Each structure stands twice: as C-alpha cells, then as structure tokens.
Structure 1
Amino acid sequence: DEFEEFPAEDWAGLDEDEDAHVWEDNWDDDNVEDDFSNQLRAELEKHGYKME
C-alpha cells in the first residue's frame, strides 16, 4: 500500500476530473417510515411507552 508517483510532472486545470455532487447533506431530514425505524416501533411500543 505505497503511494506510487505520478507519470507526468505537470498538468493543466482541466486534466483532473470529479463527480460534482458526492459529499451531500440530504440525509438530515424527517423520514420516519424507513423499515429499521419500524422495527424499533415494536420495541419502544412494547414497553407501554407510546406516543405519536
């Protein structure tokens, strides 16, 4: 796992490429209806502590 050196010493600004939208913040939202959250919907509502 050694960082091998580059074939070219110099390159222009258009030589590199990216995927534009990678590191996004859309996950901090209010989606409750995911399946894993349904599974906890058993366990928090099996101990008699239930709320909407």
Structure 2
Amino acid sequence: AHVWEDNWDDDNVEDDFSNQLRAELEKHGYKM
C-alpha cells in the first residue's frame, strides 16, 4: 500500500543511528 518503493522517507524506516541523530537535531530548530 506504498506508492514509492524506494522511498527513503516513510513513517518509520529510521534506524537507531538516525534516531539519536533526529533526537539531538530536531531540538535546536534554527539554521544559518
């Protein structure tokens, strides 16, 4: 029931390394 089979960005396809990366990276929320 997925349109794009080679989608890198689904609901939950994020491995552990990317999980702590997202955890420490979404918190700041600013970019220069």
TM-score band w.r.t. shorter chain: 0.3 to 0.5
Compare relative contact order (CA 8 Å, sep 6+) and give the higher one, 1 or 2.
1
Deviation at 1:44, TM superposition (A): 1.1
Q: Once superposed, what is the RMSD of the aligned Cα atoms?
A: 6.4
- TM-score w.r.t. length of structure 2: 0.40
Structure 2: gaps of 5 or more residues: none
Which structure is higher in helix share? 2
Max radius of gyration: which structure?
Answer: 1
Flag as ranges the 4+ runs of structure 1 deviating above 4 A.
20-32
Q: How many residues align?
A: 32
- TM-score w.r.t. length of structure 1: 0.29
Deviation at 1:29, TM superposition (A): 13
Structure 1: gaps of 5 or more residues: 1-19
Equivalent residues in 2 for 1:27-46, closer than 5 Å = 33-46=14-27
